[PDB]
Every structure is written in structure tokens, then in C-alpha cells.
Amino acid sequence: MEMRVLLIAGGVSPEHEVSLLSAEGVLRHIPFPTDLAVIAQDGRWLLGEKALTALEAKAAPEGEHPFPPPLSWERYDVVFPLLHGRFGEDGTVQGFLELLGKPYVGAGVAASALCMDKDLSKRVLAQAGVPVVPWVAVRKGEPPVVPFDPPFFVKPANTGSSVGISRVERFQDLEAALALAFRYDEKAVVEKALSPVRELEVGVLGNVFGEASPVGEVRYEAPFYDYETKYTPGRAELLIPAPLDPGTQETVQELALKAYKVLGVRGMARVDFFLAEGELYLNELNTIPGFTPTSMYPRLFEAGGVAYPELLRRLVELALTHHHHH
Amino acid sequence: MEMRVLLIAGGVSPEHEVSLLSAEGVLRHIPFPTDLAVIAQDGRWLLGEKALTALEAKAAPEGEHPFPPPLSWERYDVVFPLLHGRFGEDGTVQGFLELLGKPYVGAGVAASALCMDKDLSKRVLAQAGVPVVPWVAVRKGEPPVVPFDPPFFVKPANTGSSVGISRVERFQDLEAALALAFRYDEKAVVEKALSPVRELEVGVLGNVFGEASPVGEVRYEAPFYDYETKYTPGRAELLIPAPLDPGTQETVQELALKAYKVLGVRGMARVDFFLAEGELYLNELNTIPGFTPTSMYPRLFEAGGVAYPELLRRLVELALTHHH
Ligand SMILES: Nc1ncnc2c1ncn2[C@@H]1O[C@H](COP(=O)(O)OP(=O)(O)OP(=O)(O)O)[C@@H](O)[C@H]1O
Ligand SMILES: Nc1ncnc2c1ncn2[C@@H]1O[C@H](COP(=O)(O)OP(=O)(O)OP(=O)(O)O)[C@@H](O)[C@H]1O
Ligand SMILES: [Mg+2]
Ligand SMILES: [Mg+2]
Ligand SMILES: [Mg+2]
Ligand SMILES: [Mg+2]
Ligand SMILES: [Rb+]
Ligand SMILES: [Rb+]
Ligand SMILES: [Rb+]
Ligand SMILES: [Rb+]
């Protein structure tokens, strides 16, 4: 194999540890020679053997090299950013790689920024006619104006892994939920809580001609699909294909591919939906989905006949056929 | 407080030369010690004396240092990207500066990326209830479907300075218009042309919650506000305050601030509008407006009591305010 890939994991967002878990899964299956670079929680980079050491430790609070790191970029044919959340999944790292001129996996600057913002992505989806849950944006230090009645879900606008998210039952509890959310972002969303709800997820793979995996369903005992439920082995019930009538599954895949085109994604996405009283809502799109042992995206494509090494090989090829097209 | 500013100008977009002219304006009025760095048209950087030489020449086709440059970033307290268009105004350079950790002037990654894309920004604004002209996007290689009558304006979705824009009067000319646009972007927009039309502009200054300048109106003799009209001395007249009914000036300023807040813009924008048959349309936001001798943003704020050195002072201060 002449191909050489640079995997970047870790990061400064609250999903630092999740990103390192995703790295273990990708490195276990990727069929190209791949080097790891870790972004420690302080923003400094660990390279070579120190990055592997940090991987085993499953967290890297302190790094060695201030950005930009002394990394030999010219050794790598493709860069694979596996950095969930702010400063990784939101276009920041993508902007750096664009300036380096390196082919890289996944969505570009604008689609990455847009899909990380739960307010702006919903505006664009709603404008395209995609159903989304009623919501309002709230900015820090500005009084909330919620045209609908609780229960609410309150989120930092740029969150992942359910960090900073509250299920809010009483309006009295809103200001506490917003204040938690504002620990992670200057902007929060307040959404109408669907209850009861089923949670459906579908993977997409492609640049211009996205293709959808089978639909999967998540079930759990907790009050919502929270951080502990997402990453504690065994806690989440991952059902593939979703135990749903085939027509609803078809509508979910159609909506996912529509949203992928509307939001301008490339490389990959995991698209999350809610199903409530027969109605589908697109919840969000994640441009760098998790690859942890409890993550849906590699499992969805496995069920669709795309094995884990093949899935990773296709992501790397799509990175190269995007760049060549310019 | 000590304050040393690093100004970056030039860039790889078609607004390269415009950006160097903006740099001349900024350097003439900025009240802080400021060094220039130039991105040449080939993407390589010029530092120190070679950057000032590039600036004097008003164009830098070739640079010295491949990205990322050996620039002594620690010497600067604030970075001021003055790079108009693709790879300077669209979030890419902002993403690098975010990872560098330095305060920097103007909109962040997401607001920069969205305001540069004429299709995406119209989607968001239209959803938020801001009036915008009818439009469609066209991807390179796909057949356009334009569901309204000509005339049209055809544009690269990422353009600035009117580069690659055509007024299309008949369907037979659409193909040539789109081929022109696709030299500059993989996505084009086709908009319903308003005709006749008046053009209004408002400056915004601030972080997310902005303050609006007076409204200015641009007049010119050319068929539209094109590259030559924009940058040739005397071709464009700025009427400030614009001749509007009082309800209309207020509506323009409210719409600008609403769009600014929805998009989450920081630092500055110049927000452009159309007025046709008494109806307002928001045309675009520019997060790195021009500072050339014929540019409107410094004049809009001059008319609202904010002189040029004070405008630049507030932009640098806003960058630090956000960073803290
Ligand atoms: N409007 C809602 N109604 C019901 N449940 C919700 C709603 N919004 C969020 N949730 C619950 O919170 C979970 C996380 O919300 P969301 O998908 O917005 O967060 P995330 O942090 O972006 O997720 P991921 O880790 O997939 O990136 C959902 O899986 C669901 O359990
Ligand atoms: N829909 C339209 N109807 C009428 N005139 C138009 C329309 N779109 C563009 N124009 C004309 O084309 C000019 C440039 O359009 P636009 O503002 O979209 O380009 P830009 O390159 O982003 O401008 P800037 O240099 O201000 O960034 C307008 O100022 C106007 O003269
Ligand atoms: Mg998410
Ligand atoms: Mg989710
Ligand atoms: Mg513009
Ligand atoms: Mg304009
Ligand atoms: Rb997301
Ligand atoms: Rb809304
Ligand atoms: Rb713009
Ligand atoms: Rb449209």
C-alpha cells in the first residue's frame, strides 16, 4: 500500500474522549497505512509515539506542540479529521486543511459549520421543506421567547454527544437549563420535546450521489439518549434494520438524502430523525459521526453490505475524487 | 494596553487587487502599530519588506512562503484579515486563526462561510422572514431550471466585486452566463433581475447585536454596479443619507440588524439592499467590505459620526472583546 493517511483525533471540544474512542475504531479497520495525530485538550498536538500513548490512555489533557504543529504534511495523501464537535467538526480544521491544500475526508468548511449549528441547520432544512421540530434560538444574556409549551429540550447550539442538553418540564426550570447550555456555547436552542418518540438514524456515504444505509433505531431506558447512554457498553439498544414498516424506512432514507444535498455535505453524514405519532422530523445531521464501539454509523453501513474496512476505504477515495474535481 | 495589529491582504480570490487597495485604506487610518502580510495570487505569503513592496505594486502574483508562513504570530495582539472573497472571507482563513488562538477582526467561521454563499445566505434569511429576490442555485454540469421570466442576474455563488456576474435578457444567453460564473465557483445562483432598481447599503458594527450606520444609496450610469463602476473614481455616487421616506430608512436598518443577528456576524458587515416598486429586498451581507478609495463602508459610518480611525479602533476592540 503506497497510500498514507493522517488521522487527527482528540480535540478541545467536550467530545475529546469520544473522538479518541472513534480513532481506535478507525485505526482498527482502515486498510491504508495511517498515522495518528492527537489534539490534546489544551490545543497542543501530540505526534508519533506520544499520540499512540495518548490513545491508550483514552484522554490527552496536555499536548506538546503549539498549533500549527511541525507535522510533515507532505507524507500524507489524505487527512482524516476525526474531531467531533467545536474546532473539529464545525469547519475550523477544514479551513486549515483547505489552505494546506490537502485532500481530506468529509464535509467542507460551509457545510461543516452549518451542520454543527442546530439553529442554522434547522432554518435551512425548514426552508427546503424538511420537517423539523418547533424550536427557537436563544442568545446568552437575552431573555427567551418560547412560542410553545413545555416539555422542552434545551441544547447548546453547537453541541454533540448530548453534552449540555436538558429535558425541561416546567418553565421555571428553563433558566437553569439555558444556563447549563451557555457553559458550552453563546447560543442555545429550545425545542419542543416529542414524547413518546422513536429515534431513527441513517448513514450517508458519497459526494454528489449520496447513498443511504439501512435505517437503524436506538432504544434505551434512560430519560433521553444521553452521554452515559451513548457510550456505556450495553446501555443503548441498537436495532438494525429499525423494526418499522418498509415504507416509513423508505421515507426516512429519502429525507436523509434530500437533507444531505440541501446542506451541501460530502464524504459522510449520520442523519438523526424522530418519529412521533406517525410523523417524521429530521433531528440533526452529523458530518463526523462517532466510530466508537457503541456508534451507529459503521454498524448501519455493515448492515447495508459495506464492511468496516471498505467503508473507510470509500471515505478516503471520496476525499480524493472531490479534490481532483476541484 | 499594548496593541500591535497584523493586517493580512491580497489572497487567491479574484478580489486580490481590491484587497490590496483595501489594505492601503486601513493602513492609512488605523491608529495602532500595524504590520502587513500579503498572500500572493499563487497562495504563497510575503512578509515584512516584500509585503510593502507588493502593496506598492498593487498586485502580487507570486509569493515567497508556502502556507503556513513562518510568521512571528506571538508579536501580534490582533489579526485583521482583509482578504475579500474565496479563501479569505468565507471561513477558511478564519478557521486557521481560530486554531492559532489569536483574536481576529470580523466574522467567525460559520457567519463568514454563510454570508459568502449567495444561495445559503438567502435560504437562511428567507426562512427568517427577510425579503430576498426569487433565486435558484445551479451546480456546475447540471442543467439549470429557472422558474421565473428573464431578465436574470447570474452569479458565482461565492463572488464579490461583481466578478463573473451577467445580466441575462434572453434564455439563449443563459448558457454563456453560467459558463462565465462557473469559472469562479462550482455553484452559481440565478436571480430574478429587479428592473429598474435602487441600491441601498447599511454598515453594521458590533458583535452579533450590531449598530447600524445611516443608509446610503449608490447611483451610477452603467447597466449595473459592475467591477469597473465599483472601483473607478467618480463612477459611483454615494447619496448619504439615502433619499427615503422615514419608515423606509428604519425598515432597512432593522432588516440589516436582524440578518446580522440571525447569521451571528461579529465585527462588521456591509449589508446591501434593493428597492423596487416600493418593496425592499436584502441582497447580501459582506463581512469583509471594501476599504478602497471608492468603497462605501467607511463613508457610511463617517456619516453616522464614526470617523475612519475610530471605526478601525472599534473593529480591533471588538475582536478582543469577543476573544475575552
Ligand atoms: N425535540 C426533542 N424531542 C425528544 N427528544 C429529544 C429532542 N431533542 C433532543 N432529544 C433527545 O436528546 C438526544 C440528543 O439530542 P441531539 O441529537 O440534538 O444531540 P447531539 O448531542 O447533537 O447528538 P449526537 O451525539 O448524535 O451528535 C436525542 O437522541 C434525543 O434522545
Ligand atoms: N437580482 C438583482 N436584480 C437587480 N440587480 C442586481 C441583482 N443582483 C445583482 N444586481 C446588480 O449586480 C450588482 C452586484 O451584485 P451582488 O451584490 O450580488 O455582487 P457582489 O460581487 O457580492 O457585490 P460586492 O462587490 O458588493 O460584494 C448589484 O450591486 C446590482 O447592481
Ligand atoms: Mg449531533
Ligand atoms: Mg443526535
Ligand atoms: Mg458581495
Ligand atoms: Mg453587493
Ligand atoms: Rb451536528
Ligand atoms: Rb423557528
Ligand atoms: Rb458576501
Ligand atoms: Rb430558492
Grid cell digits, residue A185:
456555547
d(CA B109, CA A178): 24
E strand residue ranges, B40-192: 45-46, 78-81, 135-139, 152-156, 166-168, 187-192
Whole-number Cα distances in Å, B287 to A106, A291, B32: 26, 36, 22
SS3 A254: helix
* H or E element that contains B299: helix B297-303
Q: DSSP label at B273? A: E
* Domain identity same for B79 and B23: yes
Q: Which residue has the cell 499594548?
A: B2
Judgement on whether residues B20 and B146 belong to the same structural domain of the protein: no
Which CATH number covers residue B152?
A: 3.30.1490.20
Q: Give the C-alpha distances (Å, rounded to integers) separating B218 from A280, B19, B199, B303, B304.
A: 47, 21, 6, 15, 17
C-alpha cell at B22: 483595501
Cell numbers given for B94:
478564519
Q: Which residues pair with B191 in a beta bridge?
A: B135, B153
* Domain C-terminal end among A142, A172, A190: A190
List Cβ neighbours of A55 (8 Å cut-off, separation of 6 or more).
A9, A20, A23, A24, A27, A36, A38
Cell numbers at B145, concatenated: 431550471
Angstrom distance (rounded) from CA A84 to CA A79: 15
Instruction: Report residue A177 as a C-alpha cell.
Output: 437549563
Measure B324 CA to nearest chain A CA, in Å: 13
Print the domain residue range for B211. Answer: 107-131+195-321
B185 lies within 8 A of chain A by CB: no
For residue B149, give the 3-state DSSP assignment.
coil
Minimal CA separation from A236 to chain B, in Å: 33
- Do residues A153 and A195 make contact, with C-beta atoms less than 8 angstroms apart? no
For residues A114 and A211, membership in a common domain is answered with yes
**Do A174 and A43 share a structural domain?**
no
Q: Which residue, among B322, B315, B319, has the nearest Cα to B26 in the 3D structure?
A: B315
Is residue B278 classed exposed, middle or buried when 0-12, 13-18 and 19+ CB atoms within 10 A define those classes?
exposed
Which residues of chain A neighbour B106 with C-beta distances below 8 Å? Answer: none
Identify whether residues B114 and B246 lie together within a single domain. Answer: yes
Q: Evaluate whether A28 touches A102 at the Cβ level (below 8 Å).
A: no
> Is residue B76 a contact partner of residue B283, using CB atoms and an 8 Å limit?
no
Question: Do B122 and B202 share a structural domain?
Answer: yes
Residue given cell 467538526 in the structure block: A89
Amino acid at B66: P
Q: Would residue A326 count as lying in a domain? A: no
Same domain, B112 and B102: no
The answer to whether residues B130 and B259 touch, using CB atoms and an 8 Å cutoff, is yes
* Sign of torsion over alpha carbons A118, A120, A123, A126: negative
Structural contact between residues B72 and A105, judged by C-beta atoms closer than 8 angstroms? no
Q: Does A98 contact B120 at a Cβ distance shorter than 8 Å?
A: no
Cα A135 to its chain centre, rounded Å, is 20
How was this one solved?
Answer: X-ray
Distance CA B309, CA B153 (A): 37
Q: Which of A190, A215, A237 is the last residue of a domain?
A: A190
A261 within 8 A of A174, measured Cβ to Cβ = no
Give the Å distances, CA to CA, from A144 to A172, A178, A217, B322.
12, 9, 33, 22
Q: Which of A26, A7, A8, A57 is nearest to A292 (CA)?
A: A26
A302 inside domain: yes
- The arrangement of strands across the sheet holding B34-39 comes to B45-46, B34-39, B5-10, B78-81
Residue B288 sits in a domain whose CATH number is: 3.30.470.20
- The verdict on B54 and B152 lying in the same domain is no
Mark whether B142 and B275 lie in a shared domain: no
Segment (H or E) for B296:
none
Strand partners, A216: A201
Eight-state DSSP code of residue B104: B
Separation of alpha carbons A21 and A32, rounded Å: 19
Query: Cell for B108?
Result: 467567525
- Do A213 and A317 sit in the same domain of this protein? yes
Residue B61 CB-density burial (10 A; 0-12 exposed, 13-18 middle, 19+ buried): exposed
Number of domains in chain A: 3
Choosing from A190, A209, A234, the residue where a domain stops is A190
B35 labelled catalytic: no
Which of B81, B114, B83, B75 is closest to B97 using CA atoms? B81
**Angle, alpha carbons B188-B194-B200 (nearest 5°):** 95
Task: List residues near ligand 1 (CB under 6 A).
Answer: A 133, 153, 155, 159-162, 165, 191-194, 197, 199, 224-225, 272, 274, 283-284, 286
B286 is catalytic: yes
Name the one residue in this structure whose C-alpha cell is 444556563. A179
- Pair B112, B30 in one domain: no
Query: For the packed helices B308-323 and B16-29, what is the interaxial angle rounded to 10 degrees?
Result: 100
Which residue carries 446542506 as its cell? A263
Q: Give the phi and the psi of residue B72 in degrees, each rounded to 5.
A: -80, 80
Q: Are residues B222 and B292 part of one domain?
A: yes
CATH code of B81's domain = 3.40.50.20
In this structure, the residue with its CA closest to atom 14 of ligand 2 is B162
CA dihedral A43, A44, A46, A50 (to 10 degrees): -100
Sign of CA dihedral A154, B112, B106, B197: negative
